Amino acid sequence: STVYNINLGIGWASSGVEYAQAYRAQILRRIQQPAKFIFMDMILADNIQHLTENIGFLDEEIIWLYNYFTDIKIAPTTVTLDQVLAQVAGQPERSEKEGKIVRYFYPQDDQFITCYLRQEDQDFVEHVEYVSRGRLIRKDYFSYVRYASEYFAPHNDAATLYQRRFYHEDGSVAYDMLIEDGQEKLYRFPDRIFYSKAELVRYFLQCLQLQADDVVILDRETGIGQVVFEESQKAKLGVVVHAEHFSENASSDDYILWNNFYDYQFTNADKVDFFIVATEAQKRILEQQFQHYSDKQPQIATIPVGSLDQLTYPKEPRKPYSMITASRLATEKHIDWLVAATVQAHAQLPELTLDIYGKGSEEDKLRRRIEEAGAQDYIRLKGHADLSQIYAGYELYLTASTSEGFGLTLMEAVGSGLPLIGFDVRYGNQTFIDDGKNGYLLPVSSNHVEDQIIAAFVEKIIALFSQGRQQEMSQHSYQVAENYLTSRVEAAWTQLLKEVRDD
Amino acid sequence: STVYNINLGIGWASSGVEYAQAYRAQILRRIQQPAKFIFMDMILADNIQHLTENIGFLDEEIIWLYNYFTDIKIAPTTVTLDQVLAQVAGQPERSEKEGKIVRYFYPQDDQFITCYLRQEDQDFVEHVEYVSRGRLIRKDYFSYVRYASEYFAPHNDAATLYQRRFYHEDGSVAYDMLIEDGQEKLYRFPDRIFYSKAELVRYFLQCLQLQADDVVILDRETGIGQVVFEESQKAKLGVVVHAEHFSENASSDDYILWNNFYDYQFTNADKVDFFIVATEAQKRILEQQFQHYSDKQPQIATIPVGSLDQLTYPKEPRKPYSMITASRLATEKHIDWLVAATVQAHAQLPELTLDIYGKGSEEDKLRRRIEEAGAQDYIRLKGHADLSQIYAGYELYLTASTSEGFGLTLMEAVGSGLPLIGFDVRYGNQTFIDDGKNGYLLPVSSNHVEDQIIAAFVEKIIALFSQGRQQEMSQHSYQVAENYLTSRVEAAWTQLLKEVRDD
Amino acid sequence: MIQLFDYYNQETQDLHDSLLAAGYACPTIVIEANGFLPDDMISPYTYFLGDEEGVDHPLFFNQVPVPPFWEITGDHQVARVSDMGEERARIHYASQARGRLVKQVDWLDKKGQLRLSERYNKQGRCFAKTAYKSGQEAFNTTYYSTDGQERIVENHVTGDIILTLDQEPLRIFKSRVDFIRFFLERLDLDLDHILFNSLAYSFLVSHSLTGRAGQDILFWQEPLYDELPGNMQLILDNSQLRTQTIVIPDLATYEKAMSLAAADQQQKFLHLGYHYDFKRDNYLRKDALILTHSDQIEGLDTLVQSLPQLVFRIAALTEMSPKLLSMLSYKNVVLYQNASLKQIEQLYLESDIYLDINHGGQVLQAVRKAFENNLLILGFEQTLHDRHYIAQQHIFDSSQPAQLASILEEALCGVEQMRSALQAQGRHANDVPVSLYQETLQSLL
Amino acid sequence: MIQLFDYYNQETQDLHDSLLAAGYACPTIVIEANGFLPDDMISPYTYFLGDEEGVDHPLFFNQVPVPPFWEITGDHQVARVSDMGEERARIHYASQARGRLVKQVDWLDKKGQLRLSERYNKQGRCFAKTAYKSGQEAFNTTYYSTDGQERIVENHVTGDIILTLDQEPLRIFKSRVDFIRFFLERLDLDLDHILFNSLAYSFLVSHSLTGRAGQDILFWQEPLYDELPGNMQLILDNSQLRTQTIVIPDLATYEKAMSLAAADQQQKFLHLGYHYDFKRDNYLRKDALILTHSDQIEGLDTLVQSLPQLVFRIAALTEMSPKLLSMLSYKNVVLYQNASLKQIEQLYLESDIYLDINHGGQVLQAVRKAFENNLLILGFEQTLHDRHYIAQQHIFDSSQPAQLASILEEALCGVEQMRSALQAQGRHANDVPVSLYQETLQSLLG
Ligand SMILES: O=c1ccn([C@@H]2O[C@H](COP(=O)(O)OP(=O)(O)O)[C@@H](O)[C@H]2O)c(=O)[nH]1
Ligand SMILES: CC(=O)N[C@@H]1[C@@H](O)[C@H](O)[C@@H](CO)O[C@H]1O
Ligand SMILES: [Mg+2]
Ligand SMILES: [Mg+2]
Numbered sequence A, B: 001s002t003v004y005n006i007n008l009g010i011g012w013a014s015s016g017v018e019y020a021q022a023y024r025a026q027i028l029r030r031i032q033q034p035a036k037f038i039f040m041d042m043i044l045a046d047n048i049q050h051l052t053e054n055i056g057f058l059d060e061e062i063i064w065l066y067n068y069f070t071d072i073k074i075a076p077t078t079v080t081l082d083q084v085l086a087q088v089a090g091q092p093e094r095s096e097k098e099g100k101i102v103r104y105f106y107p108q109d110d111q112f113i114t115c116y117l118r119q120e121d122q123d124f125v126e127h128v129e130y131v132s133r134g135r136l137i138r139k140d141y142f143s144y145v146r147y148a149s150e151y152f153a154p155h156n157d158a159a160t161l162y163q164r165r166f167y168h169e170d171g172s173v174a175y176d177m178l179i180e181d182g183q184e185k186l187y188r189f190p191d192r193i194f195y196s197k198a199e200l201v202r203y204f205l206q207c208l209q210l211q212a213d214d215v216v217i218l219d220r221e222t223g224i225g226q227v228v229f230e231e232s233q234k235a236k237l238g239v240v241v242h243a244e245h246f247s248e249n250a251s252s253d254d255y256i257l258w259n260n261f262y263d264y265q266f267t268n269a270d271k272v273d274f275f276i277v278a279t280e281a282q283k284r285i286l287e288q289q290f291q292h293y294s295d296k297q298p299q300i301a302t303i304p305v306g307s308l309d310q311l312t313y314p315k316e317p318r319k320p321y322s323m324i325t326a327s328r329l330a331t332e333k334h335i336d337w338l339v340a341a342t343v344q345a346h347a348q349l350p351e352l353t354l355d356i357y358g359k360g361s362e363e364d365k366l367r368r369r370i371e372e373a374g375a376q377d378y379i380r381l382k383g384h385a386d387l388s389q390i391y392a393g394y395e396l397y398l399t400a401s402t403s404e405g406f407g408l409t410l411m412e413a414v415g416s417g418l419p420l421i422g423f424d425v426r427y428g429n430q431t432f433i434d435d436g437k438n439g440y441l442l443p444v445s446s447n448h449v450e451d452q453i454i455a456a457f458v459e460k461i462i463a464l465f466s467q468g469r470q471q472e473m474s475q476h477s478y479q480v481a482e483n484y485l486t487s488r489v490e491a492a493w494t495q496l497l498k499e500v501r502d503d
Numbered sequence C: 001m002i003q004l005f006d007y008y009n010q011e012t013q014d015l016h017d018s019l020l021a022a023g024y025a026c027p028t029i030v031i032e033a034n035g036f037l038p039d040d041m042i043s044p045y046t047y048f049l050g051d052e053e054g055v056d057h058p059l060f061f062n063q064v065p066v067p068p069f070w071e072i073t074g075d076h077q078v079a080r081v082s083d084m085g086e087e088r089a090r091i092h093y094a095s096q097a098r099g100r101l102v103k104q105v106d107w108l109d110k111k112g113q114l115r116l117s118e119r120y121n122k123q124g125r126c127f128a129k130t131a132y133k134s135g136q137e138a139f140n141t142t143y144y145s146t147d148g149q150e151r152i153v154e155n156h157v158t159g160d161i162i163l164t165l166d167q168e169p170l171r172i173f174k175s176r177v178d179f180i181r182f183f184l185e186r187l188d189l190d191l192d193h194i195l196f197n198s199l200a201y202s203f204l205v206s207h208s209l210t211g212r213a214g215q216d217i218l219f220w221q222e223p224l225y226d227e228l229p230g231n232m233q234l235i236l237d238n239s240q241l242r243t244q245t246i247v248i249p250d251l252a253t254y255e256k257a258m259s260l261a262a263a264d265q266q267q268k269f270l271h272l273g274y275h276y277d278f279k280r281d282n283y284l285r286k287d288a289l290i291l292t293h294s295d296q297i298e299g300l301d302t303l304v305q306s307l308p309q310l311v312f313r314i315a316a317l318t319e320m321s322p323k324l325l326s327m328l329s330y331k332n333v334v335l336y337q338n339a340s341l342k343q344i345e346q347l348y349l350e351s352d353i354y355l356d357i358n359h360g361g362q363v364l365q366a367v368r369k370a371f372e373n374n375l376l377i378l379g380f381e382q383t384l385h386d387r388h389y390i391a392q393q394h395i396f397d398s399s400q401p402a403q404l405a406s407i408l409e410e411a412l413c414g415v416e417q418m419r420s421a422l423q424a425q426g427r428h429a430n431d432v433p434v435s436l437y438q439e440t441l442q443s444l445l
Numbered sequence D: 001m002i003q004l005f006d007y008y009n010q011e012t013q014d015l016h017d018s019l020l021a022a023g024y025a026c027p028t029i030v031i032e033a034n035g036f037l038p039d040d041m042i043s044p045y046t047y048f049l050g051d052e053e054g055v056d057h058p059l060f061f062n063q064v065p066v067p068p069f070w071e072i073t074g075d076h077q078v079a080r081v082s083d084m085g086e087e088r089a090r091i092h093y094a095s096q097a098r099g100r101l102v103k104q105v106d107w108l109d110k111k112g113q114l115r116l117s118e119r120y121n122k123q124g125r126c127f128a129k130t131a132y133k134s135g136q137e138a139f140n141t142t143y144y145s146t147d148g149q150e151r152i153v154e155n156h157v158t159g160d161i162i163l164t165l166d167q168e169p170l171r172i173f174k175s176r177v178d179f180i181r182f183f184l185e186r187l188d189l190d191l192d193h194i195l196f197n198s199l200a201y202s203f204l205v206s207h208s209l210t211g212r213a214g215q216d217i218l219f220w221q222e223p224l225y226d227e228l229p230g231n232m233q234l235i236l237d238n239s240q241l242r243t244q245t246i247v248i249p250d251l252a253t254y255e256k257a258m259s260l261a262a263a264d265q266q267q268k269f270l271h272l273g274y275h276y277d278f279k280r281d282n283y284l285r286k287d288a289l290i291l292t293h294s295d296q297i298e299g300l301d302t303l304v305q306s307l308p309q310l311v312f313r314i315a316a317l318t319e320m321s322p323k324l325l326s327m328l329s330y331k332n333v334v335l336y337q338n339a340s341l342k343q344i345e346q347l348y349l350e351s352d353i354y355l356d357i358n359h360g361g362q363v364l365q366a367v368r369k370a371f372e373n374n375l376l377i378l379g380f381e382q383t384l385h386d387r388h389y390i391a392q393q394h395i396f397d398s399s400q401p402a403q404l405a406s407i408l409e410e411a412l413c414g415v416e417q418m419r420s421a422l423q424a425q426g427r428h429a430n431d432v433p434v435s436l437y438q439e440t441l442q443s444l445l446g
Helices: A016-030 A048-054 A197-207 A225-232 A263-267 A280-293 A338-343 A364-372 A387-393 A450-465 A472-482 A486-501 B016-029 B048-054 B081-085 B197-208 B225-232 B263-267 B280-293 B335-348 B363-372 B408-414 B428-432 B450-459 B473-481 B486-501 C010-021 C176-187 C201-209 C230-237 C251-258 C300-306 C322-327 C341-350 C366-372 C402-410 C417-428 C434-441 D010-021 D176-186 D201-208 D233-237 D251-257 D263-267 D300-306 D322-329 D345-350 D366-372 D404-410 D415-428 D434-442
Strands: A003-007 A035-039 A062-064 A095-097 A101-105 A111-117 A125-132 A135-142 A146-154 A159-167 A173-180 A183-188 A215-218 A236-240 A274-277 A299-302 A396-398 A420-422 A439-441 B003-007 B035-039 B062-064 B095-098 B101-105 B111-117 B125-132 B135-142 B146-154 B159-167 B173-180 B183-188 B215-218 B236-240 B246-251 B256-258 B274-277 B300-302 B323-326 B354-357 B379-383 B396-398 B420-423 B440-442 C002-005 C028-030 C078-083 C086-093 C102-106 C117-119 C128-131 C140-144 C150-155 C161-164 C170-173 C193-196 C215-219 C243-248 C269-271 C287-291 C311-315 C333-336 C353-356 C376-379 D002-005 D028-030 D071-074 D078-083 D086-093 D102-108 D114-120 D126-133 D137-144 D150-155 D161-164 D170-172 D194-196 D216-219 D243-248 D269-271 D287-291 D311-316 D333-337 D353-356 D376-380
Touching: A003 A016, A016 A035, A016 A486, A048 A062, A146 D137, A146 D150, A159 D126, A159 D137, A173 D126, A173 D137, A183 A197, A183 D114, A197 A225, A215 A225, A215 A486, A225 A236, A225 A263, A236 A486, A274 A280, A274 A486, A280 A299, A299 A486, A338 A364, A338 A450, A420 A450, B003 B016, B016 B035, B016 B408, B016 B486, B048 B062, B081 B111, B081 B125, B146 C150, B173 C128, B173 C140, B197 B225, B215 B225, B225 B236, B225 B263, B236 B486, B263 D071, B274 B280, B280 B300, B300 B486, B323 B335, B323 B408, B335 B354, B335 B363, B335 B450, B363 B379, B396 B408, B408 B420, B408 B428, B408 B473, B420 B428, B440 B450, C002 C010, C002 C201, C010 C434, C028 C176, C161 C176, C170 C176, C176 C201, C193 C201, C230 C243, C243 C251, C251 C269, C287 C341, C300 C311, C300 C322, C300 C402, C311 C341, C322 C333, C353 C366, C366 C376, C376 C402, C376 C417, D002 D010, D002 D201, D010 D434, D028 D176, D161 D176, D176 D201, D194 D201, D201 D216, D233 D243, D243 D251, D251 D269, D263 D269, D287 D345, D300 D311, D300 D322, D300 D404, D311 D345, D322 D333, D345 D366, D353 D366, D366 D376, D376 D404, D376 D415
Parallel strands: A003 A035, A003 A215, A035 A062, A215 A236, A236 A274, A274 A299, A396 A420, A420 A439, B003 B035, B003 B215, B035 B062, B215 B236, B236 B274, B274 B300, B323 B354, B323 B396, B354 B379, B396 B420, B420 B440, C002 C028, C002 C193, C193 C215, C215 C243, C243 C269, C287 C311, C287 C353, C311 C333, C353 C376, D002 D028, D002 D194, D194 D216, D216 D243, D243 D269, D287 D311, D287 D353, D311 D333, D353 D376
Antiparallel strands: A095 A101, A101 A111, A111 A125, A125 A135, A135 A146, A146 A159, A159 A173, A173 A183, B095 B101, B101 B111, B111 B125, B125 B135, B135 B146, B146 B159, B159 B173, B173 B183, B246 B256, C078 C086, C086 C102, C102 C117, C117 C128, C128 C140, C140 C150, C150 C161, C161 C170, D071 D078, D078 D086, D086 D102, D102 D114, D114 D126, D126 D137, D137 D150, D150 D161, D161 D170
């Protein structure tokens, strides 16, 4: 019995789906629950391993689709340039280094090797480009043995990729594929032939030999979800949902629109055993919506994205009259409005310094406006640091969130006990704050009405600072953070494991 | 459980493959084991049912592929002439008839009906066609109600079938199929759609919901062979080889050229749980050919494909010097040479009869033969009729067929005790004749040159009529008929069934 | 008196709209097969089926019956169905306020060829399947029950319409026309004067019935060019025909049509417009509104700089593209992301000006509601149909007179200066008071 | 001291044999990718794969590996595989006389267009995959080890080659010819003299070797029309080149050859023939044969009544048409049907006479198997291919008078008659004694 996890792709710069899924592994490790995480998209430019390592994945929880047929095991790059030159015939003259780009020359004949380094200092080579007469011909990828290759050919004097071949530990061919118009049109095993990459996944799922004792979890429906459902009804199937599942401004009491990433699963939900949402408010609002529009009643369980080992308790100076927040300074964050929350409040509230911890673009819209406004030195501006500690050395966390289906910025913000302020919006901003205890909520007109809340933000802040609830509700912030400790998440994740396998 | 039997199609005159099922049916009716006989072919020219009952089947034993989907279940045509003309607006005055055809006329708007009667003297209507202005726009088929309809249209001044349809008892649409040039293409069910008749049978078998000990029996591979195998491995599968199973001519010791009818099964035999033939002579040849060539050892039984309820004695006077023949009446049977042996036997022994019972290829160039040749009324080409006691009333039997796997027409002859004259070849000929008693076998040069074979035919004909052997080798034919009898035929079956259900 | 229109149109709907205002209440039949007809009307194809009259619950895009697991895809202007992503079926949408309602649902084969079409009504019965032959031509049409039975089969080659009703004998019609003539007699409908919008089948019903008493009227919403349709010449000379008189609305289309006719010919026509009732007057706001699907608008910026004074309201039901977000730097640019039908009729009320410069195509007939609320409907060339409501005085090309586009509106300051530009468009759509319909047809009762 | 043959066809093998009887056994190289090679000869592609030598066991059409339950079909002309009855794989039978032996298996896409091609050897497993791009254009061909470790990868577009041998450094060639030279340096063959039948790459390796010690000979076969190829007159206006002499076995070409370019070239045009191996003598029986893939055979209805003395054996293992069975009522004629691949030669054993009046394709290379067995060949303008081995005197009119062919054939009732009549047909194809090869080829190293 096992638990399989499915997603499209991964890279250095990743999104909230993977790290939520990455964390999901660590929990399932302490469950004694064997877990495999299946990745689909074609991953070449860097090795598949190096991106599993840096998101934290264990190499033996990693089943790569296009690796599964090769008896090679998922591996980091051990291959040098000296190991490469041993497989090549002749001796090089010129050796250029432009970077990770290392180009050996054999002008004796017309052949030369451009070589690609993992890191410019290291001896480590990921892929090789062999070239004859300036025309690229073969390309080769390495983990601990050449596990893949590509074969090119000029088209309009432009090197164009055609077929790609995956090898075994002994160098023999596992299978090959044909690429027309950047698309994968045919796969050939010794025993099989495949015309649809869609139908290729079906082969993967019948090779894994899923018993009923197993469990399947789907993250992105894109590219898979049809065949996944069809091959998954032997075992137990479930679909996780991150961010928002619908658009309310497009939906009336008569009809309901789901998100394009969630529309298939929800419509066919009766085949899926269970659904997973970020918050409880999402579990309820969705559950409310389901039984109305179409009468079908799947079961829904609540699980968080991240968690907390320990409630973070200060003995540091608890600096009264201060603010703090963490985001990337993105136009969605609508933090250009949070600037007047500081500059209009300062006249009533003395000596309050908010702290900026984030990095994105259109950021110089934020550094340009702070100075021309009356108070330019009131608030620091800083890109990033290690956040998990500092929180307790400030007072209230401020959130301009339009909507966030969950966040761990606030999950770790109740770790150090800070009181929070956010709009009443789905979901996380709505599930960590009850307007009576630990913070204030700001229902928004359906509009962006700038000056409407420009003071209404300033309004609620002075209620914390003047006075008496300043720490009273902040101690209540540990009572709400209590329920989300990494101990109780491990409880719901195993209890859910029997909330499926039992019947 | 149940025993499902897969056969493509049927006529009135249908082959001995089709008769085997009919005999096989009454066998299972007395073993307390239910069964079903599936028919895939398009059956329109007459009603499916009159063909079923004709050969001995019971209506509730037949599953017609294009039927079972609906609620209307197989039955004779109960619809009167008056019932249809009541369904039309206005009334006729002028009415034609010829053959099985009736044509009513309502030519105020130019429209009329071509009706098709099951048989002449009766008023029951199989087909009903509608023609307005001179083009055929609809055609309705009947049993006790309207069980399907065809629609048409002109193309190049020709009647052209584009779409068909099937109906329920309430006159509700089950499915309609589209026709592009004599080949079905698409099927519109409310819940499904299909582009190939192969993948329609896949749906038929799928909905049959076969259990562990169910049995699927293949007679004819053609066009459905693949779809039979994939969807039957849930249950136990078997294939019965009716004709000769290879070509000894183009076969070396290295290579065996099989028979196209059975090839897909032999190559893939492993998937099939058992095989069936009739003469154990055929078994040991094939099963030995089987392992020496492809080295596969499937379980192969021996069962006769038609039996004797009891061996028949013709009470009424034994008709003198009579001959009789029956078969598909085709090129293979070599009926030509029998006509050549008699007119010269008409010489030394006049008056001696011969009867030809069958419907098929080149019946005409036989009837073109006797008119000019020396038999005026000396031979009877009577078509295909019920021979139940008819063999018994004739003195001797003749088969010029070159090869027969069983050759039931003489199996029913040895139940009349009749002597036999034919070639010495596998299988049914080297089973049902031991030259010492009963009939005579002829070795044959591998060639067809007229003078050689026909003259040697009557060589042993006249040693019988004159005289002394026609009395007591009629009893030895009886004493070898004792070998294959229902008591034994029923015997081999019942055990073989659970012999497979053992596992 | 009955109304017989071949096809339901924004043409026809405002035509049957205006007739009620003159007190002429006649019943309405449509020769077209549509199922979204508002509650006033019926069609010979839709009447006998038994679809419950008055109900509205059209099928949502993701409810179309599909095989197991077969995936239904997303919605902007179209929906699609696939088996393993291989394209199988297209869901063509309806035309209505809420989007993503089923009008047509088509299937295919593995080759992408056309084959079946199953139409839906505003209820959503699978009430008509439709079959197509080799060349992707037509074949026939089965109009179904709500129980699944047969009613009508129109064989599109010969035209022969097979009508098998409940409990009744089977009839066969030589063409679509006799079907119409049949359907009328059973409903017992008074024919003394008759109105129809199409030279097509709507017209042939008269030439059959020329003997029955009374006189008939033909209406022309379709444009002409050079010569008349051959059937129009027949209306001129023949008299005993039930139809003695033709009608054209458009101030342009009327005289260019009568240009081709002799002195004898002209006296058989009458010219007159329609009556649009507007939910409110003008009130000369300075505000403007634009509705797109994606980016972007030609000369959108060059206009923003050519006017400071009033707001530019641009909106979308799709999460907007950054090109549109960049324009928000300026105070007169206001966007609406993923906007709501609630937010919609607010923006129509807050603005007096509509601008059709948006690339792509129309938004739920935004142009029509721009004319209904008496805004100033205008734009360049490369616009969004319908051009039905805009004049030449108010139109331009390729953002070239984008400066005098401004001055044209700036020329409206005087309370009644706008009204001089208004009722220039007000006569281009041929808006005329019902006092006019009454004076013309009081002779024609 | 090498035989370098560009392509394999029966028109080659006749050179291998004539030199064999003339006593030239030297190493033999074949450029082509063939897997059925008679083991006397090797090819640069097949050498390094690692299958065995002396094993002839092809695959039967039904054996070719296929996905689960997928249905195989073959008709004895071709074979096909169908998932749900829909065409997926084409299977082409070997050049071999034996039916239903697998040479190449082509797979088609969901739309029916060609994509992959998996070639088969004479040893019975797939040794190469070929890939195609778009419009059924040739892309590459991968060659496999026995285990399937990549060995040869050729890119048909540029011409480059990849050689990864077993536990061996990777060399990358540039042209097909550069690879050939690498294969003569890997075996260390005697390159003293080289023999080649074409102006293709085989000829080009002679042009690449121009400096090397030796002299080379071209045996030119393929037929010529109105001008000598530019790569041919290249040896005629140049001297240095390894190839100094052109040998033409067919005289019809050798006569036209000296008939174009004037002056000296007639020195390096020599003339030879092919000393065959005849499989048996004639024996002058009254029994004859015609092989027919297509009913009917013109002029036939005449000749049966013309010489009742004799017997016509005509057959197809195909089903016989009913129009030709009407002729059976003339009882001098027996018809054979559905013949064993050893029972076709039953007629070639008991027939001394073959007549090409057939209207359709030559089956099984019918004219040639008669020549090797000395069956006297007689026919019309409607004869078949190959018309190489038939003397003009025995060729006659198309449906036009057919009994000149009779009383002239009838003229062979004596032993001296047939012997003299055969030699005309014998030297049509330029059969020569092994003596003439010794003389003409003694001039080079022996
Ligand atoms: O006049 C006839 C001739 C045929 N048969 C039946 O058709 C079968 C013919 O089978 P046979 O094996 O002799 O012919 P084949 O199977 O080769 O078509 C026999 O069993 C008969 O029962 C019959 O009932 N009446
Ligand atoms: C010519 C021939 O082989 N005919 C056989 C027949 O002998 C046998 O009785 C029947 C049932 O198995 O199957 C037929 O194919
Ligand atoms: Mg499917
Ligand atoms: Mg399959």
